[PDB]
Amino acid sequence: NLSMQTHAARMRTFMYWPSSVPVQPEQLASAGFYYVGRNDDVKCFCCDGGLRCWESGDDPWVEHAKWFPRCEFLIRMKGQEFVDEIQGRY
Ligand SMILES: CC[C@H](NC)C(=O)N[C@H](C(=O)N1C[C@@H]2Cc3ccccc3N2C[C@H]1C(=O)N[C@@H]1CCOc2ccccc21)C1CCCCC1
Ligand SMILES: [Zn+2]
Numbered sequence: 001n002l003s004m005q006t007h008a009a010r011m012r013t014f015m016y017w018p019s020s021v022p023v024q025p026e027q028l029a030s031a032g033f034y035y036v037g038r039n040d041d042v043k044c045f046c047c048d049g050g051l052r053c054w055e056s057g058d059d060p061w062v063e064h065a066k067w068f069p070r071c072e073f074l075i076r077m078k079g080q081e082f083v084d085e086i087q088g089r090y
Contacts, residue, residue, distance in 0.1 A: 001034070004045035010034040022056040031060035032073045046073035062086055 014025035049068035065086035
């Protein structure tokens with residue numbers, strides 16, 4: 001995942017992303033995720049968190065904060081406040 005530290009490199013992994021998945025590469029790459037080349041499995045370049053089974057309306061940033069709240073990339077991009085709220089702390 002060192003190769004995956006840039007937005008451009010992440011975007012390139014979605015070459016063979018299945019077109020039927022209802023979440024788009026741009027939103028995934030922007031939230032830190034790259035395609036691992038099987039089904040709809042993606043991983044974060046920073047925290048190595050894996051996500052799959054994307055559904056219509058899923059928001060990669062929200063899912064990042066839901067499952068991997070301590071990710072430093074996530075915190076730097078969205079802030080600890082956003083992460084806390086996703087985690088149900090106000
Ligand atoms: C990504 C949005 C999606 N919306 C439905 C979603 O919530 N996906 C979950 C998801 O992607 N998860 C959830 C699991 C549960 C969990 C508990 C504690 C810490 C992390 C956790 N999750 C991570 C993630 C997941 O299953 N990742 C898998 C397992 C680890 O290995 C890989 C590697 C690549 C891609 C995915 C995963 C999903 C997994 C299977 C179907 C049910 C929910
Ligand atoms: Zn992460």
